[PDB]
Amino acid sequence: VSKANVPKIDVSPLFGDDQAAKMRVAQQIDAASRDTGFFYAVNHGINVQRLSQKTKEFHMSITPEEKWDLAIRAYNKEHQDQVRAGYYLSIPGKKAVESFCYLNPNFTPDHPRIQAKTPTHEVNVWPDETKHPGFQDFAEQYYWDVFGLSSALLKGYALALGKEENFFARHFKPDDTLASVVLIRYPYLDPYPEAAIKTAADGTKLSFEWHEDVSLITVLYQSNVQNLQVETAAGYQDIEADDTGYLINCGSYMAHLTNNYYKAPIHRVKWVNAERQSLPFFVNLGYDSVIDPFDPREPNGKSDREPLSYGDYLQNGLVSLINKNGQT
């Protein structure tokens, strides 16, 4: 198996005001997006050691009782309002992965989209503060930390494409973003349940089959265990791990907007029997956000693709991903 070219890009100029230095970052984002589709963001400023520590304490200390009380409706029929936010249980001897998903902390009962019961909007559920002291506080602050990094990255992508730096970021707002954090535990198990291992057409043992992300971009922290592969014309290539940087890739909304100039890379997760973390932030816009598609390859930039509102894209995309690769 070949190893993928995944450059490390110092993103710190995107937080400053040296415009030429921003353009040089933008050029590297362009190059990576038109090659394998992945890069690592370094010099991001986020304390990822604390992220990993706090996430481990939560996963290792939560009990079955608490998991039922937080479960999404796939696992608890009482919770008809929890389609996205909450706990995604493992099934001993059958499904190894488990995860906790939370949304914009500004989604409260006061919020007008919650009042209106608009699809894909939900109010977060949290464990009891006395059993997990400080967890909710940490997780809400992490949301805004990685929101900040993602805003900067979106300025980078706008400049890469020849647009003003707020082209994408103007639609990525704290009052209405549909972005999500998912805290995924991949356990060590001995014996490892055979039902939790898929075999690929090429013979590779997999935890999660091929997919495109439902996002604009995906901002991923993982612990230092190699697992991801990206599809190329010549076959799948391994992405090297780096537990100090963020792994960045486009989702299928970016491929729509750019007439596939920036593809959403197809990627998959190899089976590895090791205790590890996978912590994505899916950069999603607002429910009514629409960007006119364009084609960077043409001088006029005109594209025959139809504009698509983000909320419709997301509702369809989240269901399709379940039907294709299973309930996570």
| Residues of the binding site | 84, 88, 180, 186, 211, 213, 267, 276, 278
Residue 278: contacted member of Fe ion, ligand IP1, none (CB under 5 to 8 Å, by partner type): ligand IP1
> What residues are paired with 101 via a beta bridge?
86, 182
Q: CB-based contacts of 284: which residues, under 8 Å, 6+ apart? A: 177, 178, 179, 180, 215, 216, 310, 314
Comparison of 84 and 171: residue with beta carbon closer to ligand IP1:
84
* From 168, 236, 282, 310, residue interacting with ligand IP1 (rule: CB under 6 A): 282
Tokens of 145: 């930390």
- Count how many residues are written for the chain: 328
Shortest distance in whole angstroms from residue 209 CB to Fe ion: 11
Name the closest residue to Fe ion (Cβ). Answer: 213
Handedness of CA 102, 105, 108, 111 (dihedral sign): negative
Q: How many residues bind ligand IP1 (CB under 6 A)?
A: 14
Shortest distance in whole angstroms from residue 270 CB to ligand IP1: 10
Binding of ligand IP1 by 223 (CB under 6 A): no
Q: How many residues bind Fe ion (CB under 5 A)?
A: 1
Residue 76: contacted member of ligand IP1, Fe ion, none (CB under 5 to 8 Å, by partner type): none
Q: Which long-range contacts (CB under 8 A, 24 or more apart) does 207-210 make?
A: 207/96, 207/97, 207/269, 207/270, 207/271, 207/272, 208/97, 208/268, 208/269, 208/325, 209/268, 209/324, 209/325, 210/266, 210/267, 210/268
Cα separation, 45 vs 327, in Å, equals 34
- Binding to Fe ion in span 176-235, by CB under 5 A: 213
Cα separation, 261 vs 133, in Å, equals 46
- Binding to ligand IP1 in span 253-272, by CB under 6 A: 269
Binding of ligand IP1 by 208 (CB under 6 A): yes
Which positions are annotated as active-site residues? 208, 211, 213, 267
Alpha helices (runs of H) in the chain, residue ranges in sequence order: 19-33, 48-61, 64-70, 112-115, 135-160, 252-257, 310-325
Binding of ligand IP1 by 250 (CB under 6 A): no
Residue 22: contacted member of ligand IP1, Fe ion, none (CB under 5 to 8 Å, by partner type): none
* From 124, 278, 289, 315, residue interacting with ligand IP1 (rule: CB under 6 A): 278
Shortest distance in whole angstroms from residue 229 CB to ligand IP1: 10
Comparison of 21 and 321: residue with beta carbon closer to ligand IP1:
321
Q: Which residues precede a break in the chain, with C-to-N distance above 2.5 Å?
A: none
Shortest distance in whole angstroms from residue 176 CB to ligand IP1: 15
Q: Which spans of this chain sit near Fe ion (rule: CB under 5 A)?
A: 213
